[PDB]
Design a protein around this ligand. Structure first.
Ligand SMILES: *[C@@H]1O[C@H](CO)[C@@H](O)[C@H](O)[C@H]1NC(C)=O
Ligand SMILES: *[C@@H]1O[C@H](CO)[C@@H](O)[C@H](O)[C@H]1NC(C)=O
Lengths: 651, 632, 281
């Protein structure tokens, strides 16, 4: 009848406050339970590895969200650093309620967790993306905590050369939370990519890095760009699309180059072997710094015939274009090379990551797909057809055909209605025409005779903005409504961020305010109880409007068009007293690079933020244990509980 | 007519801003910005487009990275000069400055490379070349130069436009002269193995080769790679996770039955501790097990007879075997549960007065059921009991602490020495049973017997040894399971993570896995302790680190470098260091990891034959009459 | 007015990398190629050059085949503006499929030479560009003065580093130089080779295209800037160029005579004084 519920992230980060949930089910109106929850148990006696935090729960205050510190000193002293095999630790809640009420042989209930020394966020940037041998590499690393504020903890940084060997190691205490340093590349160093790695001193698992290239180069004065008309070529025999490219070359100060673009063509394989056409080379003089060239279908077919190659062989490979432009009359020459032009069998591509698995028999299934140009951007307004076969509940199978156009950002969201006791669901998706893009998905249904199911329905499929309130509709499915409440919580970045409860009503609706802590991706988990059995379901919500908590806005007041040696007023705006790290690159360095590397940018920061997210897949499961484990949680009620996961991998 | 010139009626160079600052990245400063800041930048002289980093870090708002600002600088009339990476001394090269005119008027410009010390240049650098550049057009103004300097020379190209249109520009840029000869590199490879005496110390010679240029550049680099085994491992372990937890049973009956319940319950708890399988069991099981141990400790001391002896019922005469077994259980339980030490000290003292004149021990009233004793009917019961009491006494020895127990320890350790002497004598004497030999060797190895005694016990067991049916030596009888467990612990104690120990553990684990666990009594208690000890032993031994100490004397005098690729956590770590030196380097190798040492010597070697224009060829001839000024 | 070009390409690289060729040739500073001549070349049936482009002194020529034997194409250029400095220029042949593999060659005007004038002895070389002949006898001219600016010339501007009165023994020639072999009569100043002394053999070179007249058996005052080549027998070696002082010393009769009377004594007074006093007091 009565229950103690313990919720926590499945992975404990040492030095990070661990959010722990505790809750009471079916507890008499006046009854009160008090206790303590704490982290425990290397096989060294049974020593606590954390301070204790006390909880007090009532029938009218039946859930609490607790912050349990897990500090380095106590984790070290208890013996987790001396632990053998995997890094596993226990969370334990201690209350005499288990003795007084449930009559267990213990006053303890817990969960078995994993732990990691990985903590904080480490970012680092370099003087340039590419250097000559013998040149001084300036760089700096930034140390932030889980809360995303500057951290002063000691960090260890190491520089790894093109060969792969450590060339330098520094371990330094951060007063201002930035480490600025410099070193000189060996003059005799081989061209190649160098790698800088940084960790917290206590964080042996705190991987973070940045890379740069060393290459012998002289700084170009213009950049040449090969741009296909479309970054794909249909090799379907029904219509081989015509190859055409806008080739541009432009001085780095903006004006267009005048000169001749000497272009060569061939086929490049996956391994890296490019077989040039002998013939079909194109020589063209730039007009307004551009040259439009094309390869005729007859020329291409003869070139394939020249190589004894058929159009049916071109399911792999890519059409290789390399252009060496010689400036006239200056005589400077630099090359462009295009490796993006795959031979494809459809102009579109289907991404079915969004579509939830393990869906509730008796509730609408939401088919979510992203239609993208093949090697391009999302496809807008493309018609998508879904063929959904509900496999025999004992009656004859039936097929449900629903068609919808991509609303935007490739998003199509189709509600195929799934009836009770479906044996399994088989999904075939066809997007756009000519030459439909196709993908197939099969997913099994919950085992027979479940306690109940929970339908989580999201009316607005748009990624909510930071500051917009998202409303989710929660409906119990499949069993009597003995329960009077359902309980929900918001998980973000691998932490329980919010936990609350909504009483059951006709068409119950729960409001989730999307704050900056929920960016960029969070899980909505909700559950109710049928007798002594938990019923749960989970839904992933991506927040794609992410931006700075404050701001940094760099600007140059004026109309640009500055001359050399003039005064430029660089304006810096922010919302706090901030340490602003600056650096001005000559853009020629991007052109010079054999493999260009994108700078550090806000998308990388948000991606780094969500590397702590324990969540795997879009949510949902056949059982509440699966739902909680899929969300990223560990759970125990005293009878049903979660075994430790195989780390973050989710194999 | 058409060849008219404007010679020296042009802007006089003094009034031309000369462009000289050409950085590839700049503005690297970090500034404190209190919500707003304005930096009055002074632009560099290179006409390109700049991309500006911006990371804002603050205590209250955290990290913010701005969208980069594009800033491009353009002069509308300018000269661009790409100098090569490096040019050899005394080898002619073509400098190719290009004038760009983006005005709507044709420009006539007089261009010359200013005379500079270290460069040899057409006509001595005084002569200047007029050239006319159409509107919206560019033209190269190639100059041919051969450099005489040995290091670097700043060369200034000056373009003086008409006085009618005072266009003008100047570029001062530093030309790097390549050192005499050409770069060459030799890598010396030496495999490393400081384990035992092989390559612990060695001396590496330099480059004798007289092909080196003496006053050229000289650099040397030392770098080392260590390689651990790539094997996927043969170890098994991890006896069933949940079967061991089914041995936890609260003591019900009187003493012997309590011990039948408590001894596997403690052993299971110790195994689950030692093997770290609590994570795969219900989380509060350890709390329950510890409460069972606490209940067991409280239970057993109610059957404790006159200062430290045990029987199931107080009226019964004390059993030596049970008292030793209870002592072994409660001495280990002392780690989990803070029991009374003095009671254990008394219990060991009582066993001392069960020893005879020599080391032998006897039991005047054994336990009722032989299942506790492993079916020890007949055979080497007295020998096995003597070893068994010695094992129990050794566990009890650790209880002794502080001044009061310093004499108590002394009598026990002397008794242990007499017991050890008897146990080695019995092993020496002849053909004991395998069970007796294994327990005797285990007892001797616990008490760290001298090699004169310990080795004979070890060697005699090998002579006895008989294969069980898979591998190693002792469905299967309880005696085989118990004997193997004693042998496995003896092998581990004698040699850590022994190869023979691996095979014994594999058989014993298989024996343990019958329908989810052992169902037998005495064997299980020993086997759980042995298997857990094996699992700790296999993972405890970790070899890490390689340490290479290098020393030499040379141009930079006495110098020494010690580099170690250990640091406690080897992150696939390989390491390189620079160590320029003379022609001999002394190498001292420490640590315990296989590796490879590479010493790289780089220097300038004689130039050798030309590579260019050995495949492709080009030739050009010019005929006519060229109009010249100031040729004479 | 006009000039005529002949460009030849070929390859020995059938063993090496194969591919078509781009010839990038740079014309003399004031010459641009005639488009009419080049386009006629481009429209021939067996043209060799299958595409071209030009602006200013630059001509690009695409050759879609490269044979083992010489493949030559001629064209012409017209002079925009006089050439101000006697200098070579370069032509560069890039492989179409391997621009890294190339051949770059210097060529010169018809009267001029392929490379810049440079003096080399053993492992050291020295610039030889410039107009050699000071060739100055002030005694028989109206420019001679009693002002006494000889020391000012030597010390301040254009400033002198070596100074000798030298007897010329032979006039020889080597490479692009005429070589006066001399013996030092008296030393006046040194910077390099402080151990220079009278009766030492020395070499004073002059560029062969220079029209300096120096007679063996006569004694000349020779001062100038230090060289850097040195003789093969070890003695430091000098080159005559702009701002060197070359003057023939007169006799008593050619000092006693009215035209240089007492002015020649002032020259002699400087010559002894500077050699003993040194440049700075
Ligand atoms: C951490 O980085 C090191 C060095 O690159 C690498 O060997 C290791 O596999 C990384 N660990 C993870 C979990 O990525
Ligand atoms: C400017 O150059 C163009 C291009 O050759 C020419 O047509 C025009 O006559 C020139 N004007 C002057 C004033 O030289």
């Amino acid at each position: 009848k009565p229950r103690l519920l313990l919720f926590s992230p499945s992975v404990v980060h040492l030095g990070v406050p661990l959010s722990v949930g505790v809750q009471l089910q079916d507890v008499p109106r006046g009854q009160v339970v008090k206790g303590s929850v704490f982290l425990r148990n290397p096989s060294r006696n049974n020593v606590p590895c954390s301070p204790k935090v006390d909880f007090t729960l009532s029938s009218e205050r039946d859930f609490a969200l607790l912050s349990l510190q897990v500090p380095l000193k106590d984790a070290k002293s208890c013996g987790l650093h001396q632990l053998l095999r995997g890094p596993e630790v226990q969370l334990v809640a201690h209350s005499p309620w288990l003795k007084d009420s449930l009559s267990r042989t213990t006053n303890i209930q817990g969960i078995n967790l994993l732990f990691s020394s990985r903590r904080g966020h480490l970012f680092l940037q370099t003087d340039q993306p590419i250097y000559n041998p013998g040149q001084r590499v300036r760089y700096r690393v930034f140390a932030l905590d889980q809360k995303m504020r500057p951290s002063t903890d000691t960090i260890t940084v190491m520089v790894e050369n093109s060969h792969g060997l450590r060339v330098r190691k520094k371990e330094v205490y951060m007063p201002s939370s930035i480490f600025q340093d410099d070193f000189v590349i060996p003059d005799i160093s081989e061209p190649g990519t160098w790698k800088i790695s940084a960790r917290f001193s206590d964080g042996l698992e705190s991987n973070s890095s940045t890379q740069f290239e060393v290459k012998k180069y002289v700084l170009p004065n213009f950049e040449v760009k090969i741009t296909p008309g479309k970054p794909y070529i249909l090799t379907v025999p029904g219509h081989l699309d015509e190859m055409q490219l806008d080739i541009q070359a432009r001085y780095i100060y903006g004006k267009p180059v005048q000169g001749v673009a000497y272009v060569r063509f061939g086929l490049l394989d996956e391994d890296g072997k490019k077989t040039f056409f002998r013939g079909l080379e194109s020589q063209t003089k730039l007009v307004n710094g551009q040259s439009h060239i094309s390869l005729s279908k007859a020329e291409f077919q003869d070139a394939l015939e020249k190589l004894n190659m058929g159009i049916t062989d071109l399911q792999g490979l890519r059409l290789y274009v390399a252009a060496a432009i010689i400036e006239s009359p200056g005589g400077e020459m630099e090359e462009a090379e295009l490796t993006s032009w795959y031979f494809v069998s459809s102009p579109f591509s289907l991404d079915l990551s969004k579509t939830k698995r393990h869906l509730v028999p008796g509730a609408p299934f939401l088919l979510q797909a992203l239609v993208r140009e093949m090697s391009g951007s999302p496809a807008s307004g493309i018609p998508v057809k879904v063929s959904a076969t509900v496999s025999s509940p004992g009656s004859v199978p039936e097929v449900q055909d629903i068609q919808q156009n991509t609303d935007g950002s490739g998003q199509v969201s189709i509600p195929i209605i799934i009836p009770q006791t479906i044996s399994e669901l088989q999904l075939s998706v066809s997007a756009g025409s000519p030459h439909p893009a196709i993908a197939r998905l099969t997913v099994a249904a919950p085992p027979s005779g479940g306690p109940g199911f929970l339908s989580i329905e999201r009316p607005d499929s748009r990624p909510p903005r930071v500051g917009d309130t998202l409303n989710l509709n929660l409906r119990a499915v499949g069993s009597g409504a003995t329960f009077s409440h359902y309980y929900y919580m918001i998980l973000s970045r691998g932490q329980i961020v919010f936990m609350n409860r909504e009483p059951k009503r006709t068409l119950t609706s729960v409001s989730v305010f999307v704050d900056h802590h929920l960016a960029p991706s969070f899980y909505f988990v909700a559950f109710y109880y049928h007798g002594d059995h938990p019923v749960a379901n989970s839904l992933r919500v991506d927040v794609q409007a992410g931006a700075c908590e404050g701001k940094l806005e760099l600007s140059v007041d004026g109309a640009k068009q500055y001359r050399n040696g003039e005064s430029v007023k660089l304006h810096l705006e922010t919302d706090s007293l901030a340490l602003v790290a600056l650096g001005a690159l000559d853009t020629a360095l991007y052109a010079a690079g054999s493999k260009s590397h994108k700078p550090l940018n806000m998308g990388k920061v948000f991606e780094a933020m969500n590397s702590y997210d324990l969540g795997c897949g879009p949510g949902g499961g056949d059982s509440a244990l699966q739902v909680f484990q899929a969300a990223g949680l560990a759970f125990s009620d005293g009878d049903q509980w979660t075994l430790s996961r195989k780390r973050l991998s989710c194999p | 007519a058409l060849e008219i010139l404007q010679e020296e009626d042009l802007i006089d160079e003094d009034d031309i801003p000369v462009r000289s600052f050409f950085p590839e990245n700049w503005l690297w400063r970090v500034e404190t910005v209190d919500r707003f800041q304005i930096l009055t930048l002074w632009l560099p002289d290179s006409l390109t487009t700049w991309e500006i980093h911006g990371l804002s870090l603050s205590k209250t708002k955290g990290l913010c990275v701005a969208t980069p600002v594009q800033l491009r600088v353009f002069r509308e009339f300018h000269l661009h000069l790409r100098l090569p990476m490096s040019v050899r001394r005394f080898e002619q090269l073509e400098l190719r400055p290009v004038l760009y005119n983006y005005l709507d008027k044709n420009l006539t410009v007089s261009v010359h490379v200013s005379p500079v010390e270290g460069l040899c240049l057409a006509g001595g650098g005084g002569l200047a070349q007029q050239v006319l550049v159409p509107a919206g057009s560019a033209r190269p103004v190639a100059f041919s130069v051969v450099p005489t300097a040995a290091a670097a020379v700043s060369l200034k190209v000056v373009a003086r436009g008409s006085f009618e249109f005072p266009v003008g520009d100047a570029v001062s840029k530093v030309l790097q002269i390549e050192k005499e000869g050409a770069i060459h590199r030799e890598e010396l490879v030496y495999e490393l193995n400081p384990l035992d005496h092989r390559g612990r110390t060695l001396e590496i010679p330099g480059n004798s080769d007289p092909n080196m240029i003496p006053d050229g550049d000289f650099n040397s680099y030392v770098r080392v790679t260590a390689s651990d085994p790539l094997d996927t491992l043969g170890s098994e372990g991890a006896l069933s996770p949940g079967g061991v937890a089914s041995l936890l049973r609260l003591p019900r009956g009187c003493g012997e039955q309590t011990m039948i319940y408590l001894a596997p319950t403690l052993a299971a708890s110790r195994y689950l501790d030692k093997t770290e399988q609590w994570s795969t069991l219900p989380p509060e099981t350890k709390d329950h097990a510890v409460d069972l141990i606490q209940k067991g400790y409280m239970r057993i001391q109610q059957f404790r007879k006159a200062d430290g002896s045990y029987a199931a019922w107080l009226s019964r005469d004390s059993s030596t075997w049970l008292t030793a077994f209870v002592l072994k259980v409660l001495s280990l339980a002392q780690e989990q549960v803070g029991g009374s030490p003095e009671k254990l000290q008394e219990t060991s003292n009582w066993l001392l007065s069960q020893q005879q004149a020599d080391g032998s021990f006897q039991d005047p009233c054994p336990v009722l059921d032989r299942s506790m004793q492993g079916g020890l009917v007949g055979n080497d019961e007295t020998v096995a009991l003597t070893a068994f009491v010695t094992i129990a006494l050794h566990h009890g020895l650790a209880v002794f602490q502080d001044e009061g127990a310093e004499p108590l320890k002394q009598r026990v350790e002397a008794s242990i020495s007499k017991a050890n002497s008897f146990l080695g004598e019995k092993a020496s004497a002849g053909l004991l049973g395998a069970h007796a030999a294994a327990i005797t060797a285990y007892a001797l190895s616990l008490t760290k017997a001298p090699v004169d005694l310990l080795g004979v016990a070890h060697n005699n067991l090998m002579a006895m040894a008989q294969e069980t049916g898979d591998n190693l030596y002792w469905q299967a009888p309880a005696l085989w399971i118990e004997t193997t467990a004693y042998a496995l612990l003896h092998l581990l104690l004698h040699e850590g993570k022994a190869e023979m120990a691996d095979q014994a553990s594999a058989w014993l684990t298989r024996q343990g896995s019958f329908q989810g666990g052992f169902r037998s009594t005495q064997d299980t208690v020993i086997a759980l302790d042995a298997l857990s000890a094996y699992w700790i032993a296999s993972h405890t031994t970790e070899e890490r680190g390689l340490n290479v100490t290098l020393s030499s004397t040379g141009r930079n005098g006495f110098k020494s470098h010690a580099l170690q690729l250990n640091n406690r956590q080897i992150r696939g770590l390989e390491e390189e260091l620079q160590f320029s030196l003379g022609s001999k380097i002394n190498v001292k190798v420490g640590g315990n990891s296989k590796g490879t040492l590479k010493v790289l010597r780089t220097y300038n070697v004689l130039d050798m034959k030309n590579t260019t224009c050995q495949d492709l060829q080009i030739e050009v001839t010019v005929k006519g009459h060229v109009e010249y000024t100031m040729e004479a | 007015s006009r000039v005529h070009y002949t460009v030849c390409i070929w390859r020995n690289g059938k063993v090496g990398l194969s591919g078509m060729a781009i010839a990038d040739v740079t014309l003399l500073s004031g010459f641009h190629a005639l488009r009419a001549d080049l386009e006629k070349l481009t429209s021939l049936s067996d043209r060799y050059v299958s595409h071209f482009e030009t602006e200013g002194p630059h001509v690009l020529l695409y050759f879609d085949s490269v044979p083992t034997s010489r493949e030559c194409v001629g064209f012409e250029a017209v002079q925009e503006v006089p050439v101000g400095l006697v200098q070579p220029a370069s032509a560069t042949l890039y492989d179409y499929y391997n621009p890294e593999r190339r051949c770059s060659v210097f060529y010169g005007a018809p009267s001029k030479s392929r490379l810049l004038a440079t003096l080399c002895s053993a492992e050291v070389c020295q610039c030889a560009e410039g107009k050699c002949p000071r060739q100055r006898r002030a005694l028989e001219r109206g420019l001679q003065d009693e002002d006494g600016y000889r020391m000012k010339f030597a010390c301040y501007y254009p400033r002198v580093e070596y100074g000798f009165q030298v007897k010329v023994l032979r006039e020889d020639s080597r490479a692009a130089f005429r070589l006066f072999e001399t013996k030092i009569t008296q030393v006046l100043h040194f910077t390099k080779d402080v151990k220079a002394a009278a009766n030492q053999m020395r070499n004073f070179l002059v560029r062969a295209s220079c029209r300096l007249r120096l007679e063996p058996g006569k004694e000349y005052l020779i001062m100038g800037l230090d060289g850097a080549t040195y003789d093969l027998e070890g003695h430091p070696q000098y080159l005559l160029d702009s701002n060197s002082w070359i003057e023939e010393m007169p006799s008593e009769r050619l000092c006693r005579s009215t035209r240089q009377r007492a002015a020649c004594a002032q020259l002699n007074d400087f010559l002894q004084e500077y050699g003993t006093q040194g440049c700075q007091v």
